[PDB]
């Protein structure tokens, strides 16, 4: 979590987002509304399932090996076989622990990156028509923020016909 979004300026998550992983939520004149962002959610699912295809399955076939349980005491060969098996088990346990920790850290960093990417994409779409309040929300200044000129935050925000900086963006009380 290095981008500081999921535990940063977003104070808490949203229980009830049952369709997507990242989304938009608003309260304009036409009432409250929520939508999910398919692109960032799909990218996160794509990378996590790439990890899942790397890990789940792909098991090497080991048919004949050495004896790993001994019912008697022999000496040199018994000690060597036990040492080899213990070395292999310790090395693979370290590999498993390091892989799990590194991939969990990368998953959390990827989630933080996707949240910050969606936030910055919305900020660059809005330009000077909105101010970031630091809660992850965007105070949008013109009219009809996400009902009729705000379903177009799929990539088609005009941000020119609603250059309303005189209302409250640059105004004196």
């Amino acid at each position, epitope marked *: 979590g290095i981008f500081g979004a999921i535990a940063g300026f977003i104070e808490n998550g*949203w*229980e*009830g*987002m*049952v*369709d997507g992983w990242y989304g938009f*939520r608003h*309260q304009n004149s*036409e*009432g*409250r*509304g*929520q939508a999910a962002d398919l692109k960032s959610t799909q990218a996160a699912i794509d990378c996590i399932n790439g990890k899942l295809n790397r890990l789940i399955g792909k098991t090497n076939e080991k048919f004949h090996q050495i004896e790993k349980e001994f019912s008697e005491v022999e000496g040199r060969i018994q000690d060597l076989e036990k040492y080899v098996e213990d070395t292999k088990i310790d090395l693979w346990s370290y590999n498993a622990e390091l892989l799990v920790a590194l991939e969990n850290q990368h998953t959390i960093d990827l989630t933080d990156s996707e949240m910050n990417k969606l936030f910055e994409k919305t900020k660059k779409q809005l330009r000077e028509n909105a101010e970031d309040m630091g809660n992850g929300c965007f105070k949008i200044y013109h009219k009809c923020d996400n009902a009729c000129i705000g379903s177009i935050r799929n990539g088609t925000y005009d941000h020119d016909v609603y250059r309303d900086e005189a209302l409250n963006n640059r105004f004196q009380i």
Partner: antibody
């Protein structure tokens, strides 16, 4: 599991006021919205209004505007819906539903409270 | 207000038949039609949240499809436990409006 406990049957005189209840259990009451649907025996389902338990956000249907008022109790995890000036047309089964947000589908429904408005 | 229409108010279908329930909208609701199942005792349950997305606990027999103004709900393996009234609801423009319903019957 998620349950929405509702009253069974309330006998209310016509022209009076009733305050239905819908106890919520098995989930966090604040983070999920509560709706209200009225179903007549001779009509279909009719959405009345919605409430946000976090800050008591109200937005009702245009037909049921002065008829219903939606309130919540975060301490007891119960959502109320007060009916005013009950007539013969208000005698129907009322359902409370948990959706997730305003425009999200109703996940779990209550048992339904039959309200016979008769003398 | 957008009017939800369901012409097949009463439909008759026997066991093992693929019954299709269609709900038509006045205008495009943009993939925002929900499906509800009201059992005759009075219990209402959500089956397909939006279109082609099954709710949790819903069996694989129920399925949904459609886009624009025409949406359909398919029950490929209809059983006695699947005999109930079926409703359609939008989630586009306040107010949220439900359909007339569709009650399944044994022929």
């Amino acid at each position: 599991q998620v349950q929405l406990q509702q009253s069974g049957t309330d006998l209310v005189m016509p022209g009076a006021s009733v305050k239905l209840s819908c106890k919520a259990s098995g989930y966090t009451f604040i983070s999920w919205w509560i709706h209200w649907v009225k179903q007549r025996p001779g009509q279909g389902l009719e959405w009345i209004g919605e409430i946000d338990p976090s800050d008591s956000y109200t937005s009702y249907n245009q037909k049921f505007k002065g008829k219903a008022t939606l309130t919540v109790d975060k301490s007891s995890s119960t959502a109320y819906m007060q009916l005013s000036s009950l007539t013969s047309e208000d005698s129907a089964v009322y359902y409370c539903a948990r959706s997730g947000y305003s425009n999200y589908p109703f996940d779990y429904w209550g048992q339904g409270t039959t309200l016979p408005v008769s003398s | 207000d957008i009017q939800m229409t369901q012409t097949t108010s009463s439909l008759s279908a026997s066991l093992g038949d693929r019954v299709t329930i269609s709900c038509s909208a006045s205008q495009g609701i943009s993939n925002y039609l929900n499906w509800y199942q009201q059992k005759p005792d009075g219990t209402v349950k959500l089956l397909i949240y939006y279109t082609s997305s099954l709710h949790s606990g819903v069996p694989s027999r129920f399925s949904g499809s459609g886009s624009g103004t025409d949406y359909s709900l398919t029950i490929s393996n209809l059983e006695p436990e699947d005999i109930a009234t079926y409703y359609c609801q939008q989630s586009s423009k306040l107010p949220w409006t439900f359909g007339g319903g569709t009650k399944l019957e044994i022929k």
